[PDB]
Design a protein around this ligand. Structure first.
Ligand SMILES: CN(CCc1ccccn1)C(=O)c1ccccc1
Length: 284
């Protein structure tokens, strides 16, 4: 029985290596990684890989790994797929822990924009969780944390992390992680998967996919939002992505909004993440 070596980048930046039979479905590898992580609430997470165009793709757990990675390396990342709107409702602290690790990368990467004060507050909760109570011995006037808190670090931001860290004395790691999540969950881009697209007139927009629905970012002044219940049908054809928008009460017909994606693979990828979010957030 021939087995392929798999390398998975974990949310703490470490590498897990395992073997699966070469005809294995994605669920087989996912179950091995989740057992390694002692993760029971697995529904929120998945594995990503990079395709021949270097785009992030979700590994479909129901399909053969080899028919997804195709010509590429069996290299993956472990990631949050469905960001819970209310992390307090997750049953386990270790679930909230991995969600925190993912969000820390969302912030450092700039996928999750954040004000100065919120960067410092989220930072302060991580430090409390990871080091425990503030100690002056470690941090002098010139202290700079090993922890990455932001896309761009300043001495002012390091100072504000320390000031808020002092306020958290006696906070336990689970408590600090829950506070981190209570703040992060409110950010306007929390759990929003962004896709570059053009509208029917050729104007460059972004489509965001999240728990609540589909967002169309146009000007900064004019963001259209479609709650999942108002979305009747999702579809793609060639480079185009289509949504069927419900008639407003006493309207005779559904409405249709069309988008141009960069290529056919980018259109299918957006279709699949929309279908999965629609299903996931219809059952929650
Ligand atoms: C849940 N919220 C955030 C609060 C909000 C809602 C409406 C207007 C301003 N801010 C969304 O942006 C949203 C996403 C997709 C469909 C419907 C609403």
């Amino acid at each position: 029985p021939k087995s392929m070596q798999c390398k998975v980048i974990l949310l703490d930046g470490s590498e897990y290596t395992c073997d699966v039979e070469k005809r294995s479905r994605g669920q087989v590898l996912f179950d091995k990684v989740c057992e390694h992580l002692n993760l029971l609430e697995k529904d929120y997470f998945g594995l990503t890989y990079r395709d021949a165009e270097n785009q992030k793709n979700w590994l479909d757990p129901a399909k053969e790994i080899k028919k997804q990675v195709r010509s590429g390396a069996w290299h993956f990342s472990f990631n949050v797929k469905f960001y819970p709107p209310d992390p307090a409702q997750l049953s386990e602290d270790i679930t909230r822990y991995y969600l925190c690790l993912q969000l820390r990368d969302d912030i450092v990467s700039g996928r999750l924009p954040c004000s100065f004060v919120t960067l410092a507050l989220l930072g302060s909760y991580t430090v409390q969780s990871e080091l425990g109570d503030y100690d002056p011995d470690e941090c002098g006037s010139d202290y700079i944390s090993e922890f990455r808190f932001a896309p761009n670090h300043t001495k002012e931001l390091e100072d504000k992390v320390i000031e808020l860290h002092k306020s958290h004395r006696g906070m336990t790691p689970a408590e600090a992680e829950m506070h981190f999540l209570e703040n992060a969950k409110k950010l306007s881009m929390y759990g929003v998967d962004l896709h570059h697209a053009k509208d029917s007139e050729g104007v460059e927009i972004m489509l965001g996919v999240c728990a609540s629905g589909l967002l169309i970012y146009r000007d900064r002044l004019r963001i259209n939002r479609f709650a999942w219940p108002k979305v009747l049908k999702i579809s793609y054809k060639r480079n185009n992505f289509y949504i069927k928008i419900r008639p407003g009460e006493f309207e005779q017909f559904e409405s249709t909004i069309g988008f141009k994606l960069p290529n056919h693979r980018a259109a299918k990828r957006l279709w699949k993440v929309c279908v999965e979010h629609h299903t996931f957030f219809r059952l929650l």
